[PDB]
């Protein structure tokens, strides 16, 4: 089975990507597993915002890396190649792994 790990910072974008991937899968092949949402990584950062000194003065940023696990149960001739061909929107790291 082809497991697909979509990773992105924007959630909407990721969602869009996932849908597209599903569409790509579903026309060619059959029995797409589904878009399973894994836990989001909220990598936080604190920094001092003064140039020199004021320690209680701080900004707390974060990067929300979202995960989408799409799986394809039956890899056909037409489907996998189609998937390979299909480039998704920018800012969405997709990894594809069969078996």
């Amino acid at each position: 089975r082809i497991r697909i790990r979509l990773k992105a910072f924007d959630h909407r974008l990721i969602d869009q990507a996932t849908a597209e991937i599903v569409e790509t899968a579903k026309r060619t092949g059959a029995q797409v597993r589904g878009p399973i949402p894994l836990p989001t990584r909220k990598e936080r950062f604190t920094v001092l915002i003064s140039p020199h000194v004021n320690k209680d003065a701080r900004d707390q940023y974060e990067i929300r890396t979202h995960l989408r696990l799409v799986d394809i149960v039956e890899p056909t001739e037409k489907t996998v190649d189609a998937l390979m061909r299909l480039d998704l929107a920018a800012g969405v790291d997709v990894q594809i792994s069969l078996g």
Binding site: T46, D56, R58, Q60
Partner: protein, 127 residues
């Protein structure tokens, strides 16, 4: 046939199932006395049942995750209450009166930059 209610309190998440029976309580494949060493916890889990005389009438299977002991107990109680509500739907008023239907929304307040804790400010001095 088994009825159900979800329990939640602090970071605990109880899964209470109500069935008709003799009144044996199992929490994560352990007895009430085994799982909760604390008397208070036991009391809290039995409270709703005590309030509405169905201690002997119904068995309940529970599995709980997260939080500590007291929190877990609270969650369990909540779950039980929910189950009761589902099952009878005419005991609601009593439950409300008791204060068990209410999800206790008190979470731990986050630590805040500047402060040592949620509210403890560090030691001040003019000089």
């Amino acid at each position: 046939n088994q009825y159900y209610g979800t329990g939640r309190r602090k970071s605990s998440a109880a899964r209470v199932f109500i069935k008709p029976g003799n009144g044996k309580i199992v929490i994560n494949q352990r007895s009430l006395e085994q799982y909760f060493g604390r008397e208070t916890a036991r009391m809290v889990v039995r409270q709703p049942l005590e309030l509405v005389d169905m201690v002997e009438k119904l068995d309940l299977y529970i599995t709980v995750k997260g939080g500590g002991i007291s929190g877990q107990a609270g969650a369990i109680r909540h779950g039980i209450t929910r189950a009761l509500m589902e099952y009878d739907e005419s005991l609601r008023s009593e439950l409300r009166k008791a204060g068990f239907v209410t999800r206790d929304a008190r979470q731990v307040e986050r630590k805040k930059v500047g402060l040592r804790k949620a509210r403890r400010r560090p030691q001040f001095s003019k000089r």
